[PDB]
Each structure stands twice: as structure tokens, then as C-alpha cells.
Amino acid sequence: DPXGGGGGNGDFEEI
Amino acid sequence: IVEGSDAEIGMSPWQVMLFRKSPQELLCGASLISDRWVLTAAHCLLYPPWDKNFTENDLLVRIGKHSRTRYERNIEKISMLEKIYIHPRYNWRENLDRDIALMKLKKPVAFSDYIHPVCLPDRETAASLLQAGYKGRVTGWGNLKEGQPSVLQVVNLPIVERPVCKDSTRIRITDNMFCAGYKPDEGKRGDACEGDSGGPFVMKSPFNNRWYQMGIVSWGEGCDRDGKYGFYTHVFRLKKWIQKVIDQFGE
Amino acid sequence: GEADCGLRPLFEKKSLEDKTERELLESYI
């Protein structure tokens, strides 16, 4: 099993 | 990170966030090695089985972070990449053998209290520290359970002797890899998990009180499983490649 | 740099220790 995605595509604040 | 705790502020100032522009999501961890150079797992960029093949334009690098999710307003630095380098012999087909890549920042980063590079091991630092029982420290914003943290997580894990490494899996382990974790008898747990990939495995030298990057979070089977271990790219064994690229392309 | 690499501004630089670094040093036997 590769580290291969923190997920989210949600709870992120605008950069 | 599983069974870790919140990082203190400025505890791991070389910690980078690999961040996709759109959708906006955390790709992987990474580490700051100088003012224009970031080190990560080649599989965070190139993994054909999953159709992953990122280019420079696809990503941002976020340095100085603590919070996973917040835009850390006068703290984090965000950068653009000039170039991506993957080890020429990286093995995505059978075992993630060499799992290492360098990213060249578009413009050098200014160091601060929250932003500082980690050292790369020399033959001597590696020889005396990469020893079974010696503990190293891993950090990242990945799953907490085989779920996403609010702040940077940290865990301290012991290096495991090769043989035990080999006997825990059916995958072929090469010299460019090492494994770390507690034994089931040991009664302490923790591991890296999905999303910690490409982050640093670090040790503090007792000789010169400096932090060294020994490993890169590569893979495992599940997270925190009894009689299983996390696998890390052995940074010292791939150092000549590293030098090579920096010397032909930067600094 | 990497001339000052591995020396954290808020810890080594001020002679402060993080909460679990001693577990590391202690394992170095």
C-alpha cells in the first residue's frame, strides 16, 4: 500500500 | 500518523505539504533540503497503476505549515515548481524500489522560525545511527487510523533489523529500503499511514546535535497492524543520485 | 543554509528541547 492521498477535496481553506 | 500526537510549533521546520491546485487536496508530505530544493517519494508524482502522472503545473508546495487545512496567514510560504526529478530506476512496477524524487522551487524560500532545512546524511552519520533499536521520528497530516488530523502529527519509531523486515511481508525488500515500528510484543504502537507518503524519517545526531533525514515515507500494508512495519526509502543509499542532480541543475 | 541545516530556530538555536526528543537520544543506547 503506497502514502498516496490526504483525501479531503473538501475542508481546505482558500489559498 | 497513527498513535502520534500534535507536533509542537516549529518542531519540524523542514516539513512540506504537496498540494494539488484543483481539486484542492493534500497529495503528500515532503521535506525542505535547502532554499530551493524539496525531497519527496517519486510515487507521489508518478504511479501508473493509479493513473497518477503529475507535472510541475499540477502542484504547489506549502512550507511553514502546522494546521492541515487553514491558510496560515503570516506563516506558511507557498511555492511553484520549476522542475521535477524522479530517480531514473524508480520501480513502480513491483516494489517502489528507490522511491525518491527532487523538486526545484521556482524561487528560493526565505528561512524563518517555522521554515528551516534538514541535513542529508554522510556515510558516517548513517553508519552510526541507522541501527536496529535506534528510534527516528516521522511527521505528517495523514490518516490517524487505517481520520484526518487538525494539526501536524509526530511519532517516534525504532528501526527494525532487516530479517524481521523481510519476514513480515511477501514483497521483495531491497537495500534502498528499511522498515521501522514496534514489535507486537513491544507494547507501544504507531506508524505512518495513507497521506504521510513522502514525509521525512529524521534522527537527531548525538555528536553534533543536528537533525538528519534518514528515510522517506514509502509504503506499508494497512497502518499500525500487529507484526507489520512501515517501509522507507533509504536516503543515504540514494545520495549520489541526489548530489548528481543538484550539481547538474542548481545551488 | 544547509550550513545551518538541522538546527531548529525555536529549539536548538535557543537551547530549548522538544517534549520527546530525549526518547530518541536515549535509544541511541
Give the DSSP per-residue string, B78-92.
EE-EEEEEE-TT-BT
Is residue B22 part of the annotated active site? The answer reads: no
Of the candidates B12, B42, B11, the one whose C-alpha atom is nearest the C-alpha of residue B27 is B42
Q: Do chains B and C touch (3 or more CB pairs under 8 A)?
A: yes
As a whole number of angstroms, the distance between CA B169 and CA B180 comes to 13
**Contact indicator for B221, B199 with CB cutoff of 8 Å:** no
- What ranges in chain B are assigned the alpha helix state H? 123-129, 162-167, 235-249
Is residue B234 part of the annotated active site? The answer reads: no
As a whole number of angstroms, the distance between CA C2 and CA B118 comes to 7
- B156 to chain C: which residues are within 8 Å by CB? 20, 23-24
Please give the residue of chain B at the shortest CA–CA distance from A12.
B69
Paired residues of A13 in beta bridges: none
A8: exposed, middle or buried (Cβ count in 10 Å: 0-12, 13-18, 19+)? middle
Give the pairing of strands B211-219 and B153-160. Answer: unpaired
- The distance from CA B8 to its chain's CA centroid, rounded to whole angstroms, is 18
For chain C, domain boundaries = 1-29
Long-range contacts of B165-173 (CB under 8 A, 24+ apart): B165/B229, B165/B231, B168/B227, B168/B228, B168/B229, B169/B221, B169/B228, B171/B94, B171/B95, B172/B94, B172/B95, B173/B95, B173/B231
Positive or negative, the Cα torsion across B212, B216, B220, B223? positive
Of the candidates B212, B224, B217, the one whose C-alpha atom is nearest the C-alpha of residue B181 is B224
Paired residues of B16 in beta bridges: B30, B63
Is the CB of residue C19 less than 8 Å away from at least one CB of chain B? yes
Q: What count of Cα atoms within 13 Å lies in the side-chain half-sphere of residue B24?
A: 11
Paired residues of B2 in beta bridges: B191
Q: Do C7 and B156 touch (CB under 8 A)?
A: no
Q: Amino acid identity of B124?
A: E
Which of C5, C7, C18 is nearest residue B11 as measured by Cβ atoms? C18
**Contact indicator for B61, B78 with CB cutoff of 8 Å:** yes
- A8 to chain B: which residues are within 8 Å by CB? 24-26, 69, 148
**Contact indicator for B26, B210 with CB cutoff of 8 Å:** no
Is the CB of residue C27 less than 8 Å away from at least one CB of chain B? yes
Q: What domains are there in chain B, each with its CATH number?
A: 1-12+118-236 (2.40.10.10), 13-117+237-250 (2.40.10.10)
Query: Could you give the 3-state DSSP secondary structure of residue B140?
Result: strand
Q: Amino acid identity of B129?
A: L
**Contact indicator for B229, B179 with CB cutoff of 8 Å:** yes
Please report, for residues B58, B94, B219, B230, C16, the alpha-carbon distance to residue A1 in angstroms, rounded to integers and kept in the order given.
23, 12, 5, 10, 38
Q: Do B135 and C23 touch (CB under 8 A)?
A: yes
As a whole number of angstroms, the distance between CA B83 and CA B36 comes to 11
Total length of chain A: 15
Q: List the resolution, Å.
A: 2.3
Of the candidates B118, B113, B132, the one whose C-alpha atom is nearest the C-alpha of residue B211 is B118
Query: Could you give the 3-state DSSP secondary structure of residue B238?
Result: helix
As a whole number of angstroms, the distance between CA B207 and CA B186 comes to 28
As a whole number of angstroms, the distance between CA B239 and CA B214 comes to 11
Q: Which residue has the cell 496560515?
A: B72
Q: Do B44 and A3 touch (CB under 8 A)?
A: yes
Which of A4, A8, A15 is nearest residue B197 as measured by Cβ atoms? A4
Paired residues of B159 in beta bridges: B180
Question: CA angle, B11 as apex, B205 and B148 as ends, to 5°?
Answer: 120
Question: What DSSP designation does B172 have?
Answer: -
B12: exposed, middle or buried (Cβ count in 10 Å: 0-12, 13-18, 19+)? buried
Which of B13, B120, B209 is nearest residue C9 as measured by Cβ atoms? B13
CATH architecture of C1-29: Irregular (4.10)
Is residue B99 part of the annotated active site? The answer reads: yes
Longest alpha-carbon distance in chain A: 30
As a whole number of angstroms, the distance between CA B137 and CA B205 comes to 12
Positive or negative, the Cα torsion across B190, B195, B197, B198? negative
Please report, for residues A9, B69, C29, the alpha-carbon distance to residue B21 in angstroms, rounded to integers and kept in the order given.
11, 14, 45
Method: X-ray
